[PDB]
Curated annotation (Swiss-Prot), chains D, E, F, G, H, I:
Residues shown, of full length: 614 to 628 of 758
Location of the protein in the cell: Cytoplasm, Cytosol; Cell membrane; Cytoplasm, Cytoskeleton; Cell projection, Axon
Organism: Homo sapiens
PTM notes: Phosphorylation at serine and threonine residues in S-P or T-P motifs by proline-directed protein kinases (PDPK1, CDK1, CDK5, GSK3, MAPK) (only 2-3 sites per protein in interphase, seven-fold increase in mitosis, and in the form associated with paired helical filaments (PHF-tau)), and at serine residues in K-X-G-S motifs by MAP/microtubule affinity-regulating kinase (MARK1, MARK2, MARK3 or MARK4), causing detachment from microtubules, and their disassembly. Phosphorylation decreases with age. Polyubiquitinated. Requires functional TRAF6 and may provoke SQSTM1-dependent degradation by the proteasome. PHF-tau can be modified by three different forms of polyubiquitination. 'Lys-48'-linked polyubiquitination is the major form, 'Lys-6'-linked and 'Lys-11'-linked polyubiquitination also occur.
Annotated crosslink Glycyl lysine isopeptide (Lys-Gly) (interchain with G-Cter in ubiquitin) location: 2, 15
Protein name: Microtubule-associated protein tau
Gene designation per UniProt: MAPT
Tissue: Expressed in neurons. Isoform PNS-tau is expressed in the peripheral nervous system while the others are expressed in the central nervous system.
Length: 17, 17, 17, 15, 15, 15, 15, 15, 15, 17, 17, 17
């Protein structure tokens, strides 16, 4: 349920988890 | 359920999870 | 349930967790 | 992992 | 991880 | 982590 | 100039 | 100039 | 100049 | 020699001018 | 010697001008 | 010698001008 290493103009959403 | 190494202008969504 | 290394213009949302 | 370089990204979802 | 360089990002979701 | 350099980011969600 | 949507761009010069 | 939506950009010059 | 939305930008010059 | 309407993630990098 | 309407993920990269 | 309407992820990199 974790996230790691969001870099380099990276984008993440996970709407409605 | 985890995400790793989202770089290089990368984008992920996972809507309605 | 943790997050690590959000850099490089990184953005994370996780609505409705 | 080394020397990664890229542009933007666009994604749209309608509900 | 080294020399990573990139641009922006755009993402939109309606509900 | 080294020499990482990037731009902005845009993300919008309506409900 | 109407409804334009696009991605990134990469371009390099070595001298 | 209307509904324009785009990503990033990368450009480099070495001299 | 209407509904314009965009990401970052990276641009470098070495001299 | 002017500039106008630099928006929408716009970037100008004039050098040696 | 002008430029107009650089949009839509466009990039102009003039050098040595 | 002007520039106008640099939008939509637009980037201009005039050098040596």
């Amino acid at each position: 349920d974790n996230i790691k290493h969001v870099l380099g103009g990276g984008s993440v959403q996970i709407v409605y988890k």
